C-alpha cells in the first residue's frame, strides 16, 4: 500500500548509492600481480573411527586437537599430530549436524534435529565428559553454533532466526530476526564483535552482537547459501551456495567484489574456508573433491581429491599449517 | 619413541574397541522412517507399539519376535523437507500413512507427497510400506457419498472393495522405479498384532533382498 512503494523507492536508492561506488573492479586492479603457483597438497593423516556420515568438524585454538560429529551419535576429539582419540562422547540424539570447540578448550557444543544445543564440559574432576548444559528454545533444527567467550554461544536454526545465549542461565540473551528462509550457517568476526549469517533466501546479513541489530544485507546469489567465512582481515567475507558459485563481498563497500565459478562445476558448495593470509580460498563441493581458488585472481589454484563422497566439513588451523576435510564416507583427512 | 604416549595409544585403542562394539550393537536394529500427510492416522499407527523436552524428532523403540525396531517421527519439523531428508538415507523402510477417508483435495496432497518421497534421489533402493488408515469411515463415506466427487475420472461402481483396490493401485503406480524398489500395501485393521506382523514380514523381505544384493548374487 502506502509503504510498499516507499520500500521499493528505498531499495532503488540503496542500489543507486551502492552502484556509484563501483568505480573499478578487483580483478582489473589485481591482474598486475604475480599468480600463485599450482598448489599441490598431500594427505598427511587419515582419521578413521566414524561409522557414519561426518556432518561437522572444528579445530581447536591450539591447532592440534579437533572435534568431529557423526550421524551415528558420536563426538570424537582427535589429536591430529598422532591420530589419537582423546575423547569419545556419546550423544543422546544421533541426529547432529553441527559441532563447535570452545576457544579455551574447556567445552564442546553439538546440535541437530532435536532443536537443542548440548554443551559438554571436558575438564572434570570425575575423569569423564558430562553434559554441562542443554540450551532449548529454538523451534527448528540447529544448523551452526559458534562459541563466543566460553560463556556465551551464538546459534542458528531452521526457524529463520539466530540467537545469542547465556550458558550459566540457559536463556536467550538476544534474538536476531530478519531472515526469510532457514539460516544455514554463520561465522563470527575475528574480534567477535559482529557476525554474518547466510540464509536459504539467497541472502546474507551482518548482525551486530550488541543491541541485536542488523547492519547490512548482501544479495546476489541465485540459490540457498550453505556456507560462509569471514576474511582474516575482518573487512570481507565469502559465501558458497547451491548454484556452484562462491561470492566474495566486502563490508565497507557494501556490495559484491568477486565471483568464483567454473563451467565444469555444477554441484553446490557445502563448505568454505580461507587461508592464514587470505590469498587462498578453500571450497568443498558435492563432486567428492575440494577446490583451492586464488581469492584475488578468481582462477583455480588447486584441486584436493581423495574423498569417496560429498565433502561436508572443512577447516583451516589458526596457524594455517594444515587443512582438515571431512566427507560422508566417514573419513577425515589432513592436508599439508 | 614414547614415554607416556604409549598409555595414550592404549587409551585410544580401548576407545576404538568401544566404538566398534557400539557400532556392532547399533547395526542390529531396524530403522524405519515414519511419514504422513497432516498427521493422518500417524498417532493411531504409533499407538500400536509395545514396550517431552525435545519437540524436533520423536523416537519410538519396540521389539517384535526379539527383533528390535526404531521408528523416527519427523512430523513436527515444519522446515524445508530437502534440508534434512538426506540424514535418513540409510533407513531400512519408509512407513507412509495415508487416511482413506479423504474436501480440499487432501488425497491429492497425499499423492503429491508420496510421489515426492518415492522418487527422491536419496530414497532409491529404499522400500515403502503403505498404511491405508480409517477403512470404516471410508466405507461409511462411500456408502453415503460417491467417490466421484474426489475422482470424476472414475468409471466404476460405489462398492467398497473395488474402490479400495483402485486407490491402492493409483498409489502404487506413482513409483517410477518399479524394478529397484517395491511398495508393500496394507489396510489398517483393528486387530492388535496384525499391523506389527505385516511390518515384520515387509522388513524381513527387505532384509532378504538387501542380503541378496550384498552377498554377491543378483
Amino acid at each position, epitope marked *: 500500500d502506502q509503504l510498499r512503494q516507499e520500500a521499493e523507492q528505498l531499495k532503488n536508492q540503496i542500489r543507486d548509492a551502492r552502484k556509484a561506488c563501483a568505480d573499478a573492479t578487483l580483478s582489473q586492479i589485481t591482474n598486475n600481480i604475480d599468480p600463485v603457483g599450482r598448489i599441490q597438497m598431500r594427505t598427511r593423516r587419515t582419521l578413521r573411527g566414524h561409522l557414519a556420515k561426518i556432518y561437522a568438524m572444528h579445530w581447536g585454538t591450539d591447532s592440534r586437537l579437533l572435534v568431529s560429529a557423526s550421524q551415528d551419535g558420536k563426538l570424537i576429539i582427535w589429536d591430529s599430530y598422532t591420530t589419537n582419540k582423546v575423547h569419545a562422547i556419546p550423544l543422546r540424539s544421533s541426529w547432529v549436524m553441527t559441532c563447535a570447540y570452545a576457544p579455551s578448550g574447556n567445552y564442546v557444543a553439538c546440535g541437530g534435529l532435536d532443536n537443542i544445543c548440548s554443551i559438554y564440559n571436558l575438564k572434570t574432576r570425575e575423569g569423564n565428559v558430562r553434559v554441562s548444559r542443554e540450551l532449548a528454545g529454538h523451534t527448528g533444527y540447529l544448523s551452526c553454533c559458534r562459541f563466543l567467550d566460553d560463556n556465551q554461544i551464538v546459534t542458528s536454526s531452521g526457524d529463520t532466526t539466530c540467537a545469542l545465549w547465556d550458558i550459566e542461565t540457559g536463556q536467550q540473551t538476544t534474538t536476531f530476526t530478519g531472515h526469510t528462509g532457514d539460516v544455514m550457517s554463520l561465522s563470527l568476526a575475528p574480534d567477535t564483535r559482529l557476525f554474518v549469517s547466510g540464509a536459504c533466501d539467497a541472502s546474507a546479513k551482518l548482525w551486530d552482537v550488541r543491541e541485536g541489530m542488523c547492519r547490512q544485507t548482501f544479495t546476489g546469489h541465485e540459490s540457498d547459501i550453505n556456507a560462509i567465512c569471514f576474511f582474516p582481515n575482518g573487512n570481507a567475507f565469502a559465501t558458497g551456495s547451491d548454484d556452484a558459485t562462491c561470492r566474495l563481498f566486502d563490508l565497507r563497500a557494501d556490495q559484491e567484489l568477486m565471483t568464483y565459478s567454473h563451467d565444469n562445476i555444477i554441484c553446490g558448495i557445502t563448505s568454505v574456508s580461507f587461508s592464514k593470509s587470505g590469498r587462498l580460498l578453500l571450497a568443498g563441493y558435492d563432486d567428492f573433491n575440494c577446490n583451492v581458488w586464488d581469492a584475488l585472481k578468481a582462477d583455480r589454484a588447486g584441486v584436493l581429491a581423495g574423498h569417496d563422497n560429498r565433502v561436508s566439513c572443512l577447516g583451516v588451523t589458526d596457524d594455517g599449517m594444515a587443512v582438515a576435510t571431512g566427507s560422508w564416507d566417514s573419513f577425515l583427512k589432513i592436508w599439508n | 619413541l614414547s*614415554a607416556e604416549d604409549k598409555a595414550a595409544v592404549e587409551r585410544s585403542k580401548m576407545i576404538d574397541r568401544n566404538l566398534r562394539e557400539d557400532g556392532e550393537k547399533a547395526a542390529r536394529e531396524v530403522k524405519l522412517l515414519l511419514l504422513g500427510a497432516g498427521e493422518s492416522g500417524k498417532s493411531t499407527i504409533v499407538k500400536q507399539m509395545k514396550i517431552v523436552k525435545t519437540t524436533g524428532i520423536v523416537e519410538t523403540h519396540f521389539t517384535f519376535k526379539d527383533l528390535h525396531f526404531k521408528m523416527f517421527d519427523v512430523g513436527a519439523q515444519r522446515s524445508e523437507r530437502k534440508k534434512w531428508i538426506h540424514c535418513f538415507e540409510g533407513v531400512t523402510a519408509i512407513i507412509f500413512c495415508v487416511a482413506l477417508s479423504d474436501e480440499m483435495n487432501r488425497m491429492h496432497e497425499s499423492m503429491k507427497l508420496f510421489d515426492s518421497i518415492c522418487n527422491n534421489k536419496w530414497f532409491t533402493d529404499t522400500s515403502i510400506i503403505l498404511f491405508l488408515n480409517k477403512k470404516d469411515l471410508f466405507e461409511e463415506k462411500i456408502k453415503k457419498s460417491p467417490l466421484t466427487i474426489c475422482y470424476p475420472e472414475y468409471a466404476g461402481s460405489n462398492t467398497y472393495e473395488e474402490a479400495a483396490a483402485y486407490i491402492q493401485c493409483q498409489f502404487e503406480d506413482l513409483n517410477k522405479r518399479k524394478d529397484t524398489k517395491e511398495i508393500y500395501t496394507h489396510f489398517t485393521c483393528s486387530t492388535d498384532t496384525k499391523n506389527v506382523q505385516f511390518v515384520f514380514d515387509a522388513v524381513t523381505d527387505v532384509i532378504i533382498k538387501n542380503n541378496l544384493k550384498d552377498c554377491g548374487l543378483f
Partner: single-chain antibody
C-alpha cells in the same frame, strides 16, 4: 572423590597380606592405578602400576616376583597381594590415580595410605639440599637434578613436583615441569632444562611447609629421590 585403603597392620616375616583400595566419586575404569610406598622417616618409592582395562602391568625391581597388583572394575576396587614379606616392606602404602591422554595431569589425587609393619632404576633424581630454614615472608627456590635428559623428542619434559604436608598425603603441585595443577595457588612456579629443574615459591604461608619431591616419568622405573624439607 576419595580413595580409602585398608589391610595394614602387623605381619610376621615370610607371610602374606592383601591391601584393598576402594574408590568413590570418579570413573574408576578410565584411570590407571599406582601403588606407592613410603618407609617410616624416608622418601617415597614407586611400587606397582596397572593400566586401565588391565592392559599393561609394571612392577618395581625390588618387588618383582612376590607382589601382584589387580583391579576389579564392577566393585571399583584395587588389590595389592604381597607374598613372602620381608623386613624392608614395613612402610605406609598410598593408592594413586593417573589418567593419560593429551594434556592430562597424572598423579593428581592420592589416597590416605595404610601402615603395614613387618615384625622381627637407571634414572636417579637427586635433591642436594635436605632442609631449608625459611621465614614466611620471602621466596624459595628448590632445585632438582637428573642423571638423564628428561626432555623427549616430542618436546615434552617429564618432571612432576609433589608436596607432602606434615601428617597428610602428597598432592601434585606441578606436572611436566611447567603446568600448574588444578586448585594450586599461582605463587608456585616451575622451570628448568633437560637435566636441571627449579620450583619457585614467591611468598610462603602456613600451608607452604612440608617435603617437596621431584619425580620423573620418562622411563617407567619412576624413581623419586629424597625431598627437600621446608619448615618454620
Amino acid at each position: 572423590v576419595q580413595l580409602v585403603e585398608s589391610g595394614g597392620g602387623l605381619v610376621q616375616p615370610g607371610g602374606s597380606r592383601k591391601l584393598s583400595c576402594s574408590a568413590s566419586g570418579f570413573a574408576f575404569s578410565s584411570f590407571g592405578m599406582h601403588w606407592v610406598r613410603q618407609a617410616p622417616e624416608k622418601g617415597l618409592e614407586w611400587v606397582a602400576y596397572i593400566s586401565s582395562g588391565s592392559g599393561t602391568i609394571y612392577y618395581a625391581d625390588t618387588v618383582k616376583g612376590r607382589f601382584t597388583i589387580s583391579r576389579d572394575d564392577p566393585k571399583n576396587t584395587l588389590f595389592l597381594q604381597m607374598t613372602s614379606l620381608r623386613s624392608e616392606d614395613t612402610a605406609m602404602y598410598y593408592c594413586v590415580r593417573s589418567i593419560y591422554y593429551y594434556g592430562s595431569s597424572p598423579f593428581d589425587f592420592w589416597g590416605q595410605g595404610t601402615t603395614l609393619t613387618v615384625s622381627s632404576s637407571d634414572i636417579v633424581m637427586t635433591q642436594a639440599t635436605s632442609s631449608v630454614p625459611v621465614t614466611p615472608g620471602e621466596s624459595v627456590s628448590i632445585s632438582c637434578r637428573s642423571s638423564k635428559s628428561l626432555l623427549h623428542s616430542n618436546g615434552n619434559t617429564y618432571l612432576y613436583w609433589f608436596l607432602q604436608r606434615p601428617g597428610q598425603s602428597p598432592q601434585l603441585l606441578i606436572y611436566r615441569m611447567s603446568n600448574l595443577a588444578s586448585g594450586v595457588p599461582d605463587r608456585f612456579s616451575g622451570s628448568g632444562s633437560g637435566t636441571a629443574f627449579t620450583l619457585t615459591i614467591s611468598r610462603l604461608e602456613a600451608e607452604d611447609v612440608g617435603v617437596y619431591y621431584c619425580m620423573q616419568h620418562l622411563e617407567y622405573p619412576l624413581t623419586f629421590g629424597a625431598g627437600t624439607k621446608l619448615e618454620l
